């Protein structure tokens, strides 16, 4: 029944300005496996993103992870934008440092 992506956006380490880190966006619990997950900085997709293989779970749903090496800056805004068939409008999940 409930096949919308359940999404978490988070950094590997607690954020500090100027310090190398990794931004992650994790989507799980969705069907069909087709999904658009985009890490965003200042309203534009972040360069350097690397996507995991799609994986399925015993509850017959799929998951995927996107991550990108990044150095958070103050004054910048980060987010994960998710597009999926189950979502009427694409959803933007904000990350706060």
Swiss-Prot record:
Disulfide bonds, paired cysteine numbers: 25-80
GO cellular component term, pick one: Golgi apparatus
Keywords tagged on the record: Disulfide bond, Immunity, Immunoglobulin domain, MHC I, Secreted, Signal
Ig-like C1-type domain span: 5-93
UniProt GO BP: amyloid fibril formation; antigen processing and presentation of endogenous peptide antigen via MHC class I; antigen processing and presentation of exogenous peptide antigen via MHC class II; cellular response to iron ion; cellular response to nicotine; immune response; intracellular iron ion homeostasis; learning or memory
GO molecular function, one term: MHC class II protein complex binding
Task performed by this protein: Component of the class I major histocompatibility complex (MHC). Involved in the presentation of peptide antigens to the immune system.
Family membership noted in the UniProt record: Belongs to the beta-2-microglobulin family.
Subunit (UniProt): Heterodimer of an alpha chain and a beta chain. Beta-2-microglobulin is the beta-chain of major histocompatibility complex class I molecules.
Name under which the protein is recorded: Beta-2-microglobulin
Record gene name: B2M
């Amino acid at each position: 029944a409930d096949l919308t992506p359940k999404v978490q956006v988070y950094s590997r380490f607690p954020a500090s300005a100027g310090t190398k880190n990794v931004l992650n966006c994790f989507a799980a619990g969705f069907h069909p496996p087709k999904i658009s997950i985009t890490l965003m900085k200042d309203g534009v997709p972040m360069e350097g993103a690397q996507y995991s293989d799609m994986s399925f779970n015993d509850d017959w749903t799929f998951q995927r992870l996107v991550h990108a090496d990044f150095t958070p800056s103050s004054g910048s805004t980060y987010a994960c934008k998710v597009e999926h068939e189950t979502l009427k409008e694409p959803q933007v999940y904000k990350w706060d440092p």
